[PDB]
């Protein structure tokens, strides 16, 4: 897989970005239906964390097989992948809601295992160019003051770090050069937040049912 992945927005009509799903498949589908999403024209970008804690995990993970669904891996996808790895330890994954995997029927377990393999092909960062506007999507954060396509980075920081949102909430706010807007999930909040040119759209759908989707193009 490649850390960065570029998406040419001019190839789609409307483009949306959704926060952490954690098995909230039905919630998502109803939203798309409600916003008039057309999978033959529009594009949905995901911040990752498609599985764990929630109920419809396989259904959510499977979305990565659809052309209209473009996701970046979250720390939960990583824990699942490492956990299922030949020399991996499931401990961490089970301590984060991965139990659903060991509760699947035989058929689904096989499907889940194949989908986990595909999840390991997911990028860590997505660069979306839309109308001369550049949007960067990562699960938790882009650990640099300046963004640069292809710049090597520690994946752990991209998917686990909460230091930036933490300072932003403590008053310490700073912009990230290199792109117009940054969109992350990972850290839940009652309402979508925005500090400088950074947006946080994880409104804890698995916890309360509030799943947020922001439109970044069209309409
Ligand atoms: Hg919530
Ligand atoms: Mn999450
Ligand atoms: Mn997360």
DSSP string covering the chain: --SEEEEEGGG-S-EEEE---TT-HHHHHHHHHHHT--TTT-EEEE-S--SSSSS-HHHHHGGGGSTTEEE---HHHHHHHHHHSTT---HHHHTTTGGGGGGS-HHHHHHHHHHHHHHTT--SEEEEEETTEEEEE-SS---SSB--TT----HHHHHH--HHHHHHHTT-----BTSSEEEE-SS--SS-EEETTEEE----HHHHS---EEEEE--
Q: Which class is 1-219 in CATH?
A: alpha beta
Distance, CA of 151 to CA of 36 (rounded, Å)? 37
Active-site residue 76, yes or no? yes
Which experimental technique did the depositors report for determining this structure? X-ray
Q: Where are the domains of the chain?
A: 1-219
Residues constituting the chain: 219
Alpha carbons within 13 A on the beta-carbon side of 159: 22
Tokens linked to 62:
């499977």
Expressed in angstroms and rounded, the spacing between residue 108 Cα and the centre of ligand 3 is: 24
Query: How far is CA 16 from its chain centroid?
Result: 12
Expressed in angstroms and rounded, the spacing between residue 157 Cα and the centre of ligand 3 is: 11
Distance, CA of 32 to CA of 44 (rounded, Å)? 9
Residue 72's closest CA among 15, 167, 7, 148?
7
CB atoms within 10 A of CB 9: 19
Q: Is 139 annotated as a binding residue?
A: no
Tokens linked to 152:
């090597």
Residue 173's closest CA among 153, 182, 133, 103?
182
Expressed in angstroms and rounded, the spacing between residue 132 Cα and the centre of ligand 2 is: 30
67 Cβ partners below 8 Å, 6+ apart? 39
């Amino acid at each position: 897989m490649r850390y960065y992945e570029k998406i040419d927005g001019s190839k789609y009509r409307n483009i949306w970005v959704v926060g952490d799903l954690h098995g909230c498949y039905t919630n998502l589908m109803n939203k798309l239906d409600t916003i008039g999403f057309d999978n033959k024209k529009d594009l949905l970008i995901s911040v990752g964390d498609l599985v764990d804690r929630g109920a419809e995990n396989v259904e959510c993970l499977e979305l990565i097989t659809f052309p209209w669904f473009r996701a970046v891996r979250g720390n939960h996808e990583q824990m699942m992948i490492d956990g299922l790895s030949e020399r991996g330890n499931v401990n961490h994954w089970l301590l984060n809601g991965g139990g659903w995997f060991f509760n699947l029927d035989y058929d689904k377990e096989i499907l889940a295992k194949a989908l986990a393999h595909k999840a390991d092909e997911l990028p860590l960062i997505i660069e979306l160019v839309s109308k001369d506007k550049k949007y960067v999507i990562c699960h938790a954060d882009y650990p640099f003051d300046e963004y640069e396509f292809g710049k090597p980075v520690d994946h752990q920081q991209v998917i686990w770090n909460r230091e930036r949102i933490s300072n932003s909430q403590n008053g310490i706010v700073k912009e990230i050069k290199g792109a117009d807007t940054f969109i992350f999930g990972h850290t839940p909040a009652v309402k979508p937040l925005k500090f400088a040119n950074q947006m946080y759209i994880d409104t804890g759908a698995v916890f309360c049912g509030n799943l947020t989707l922001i439109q970044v193009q069209g309409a």
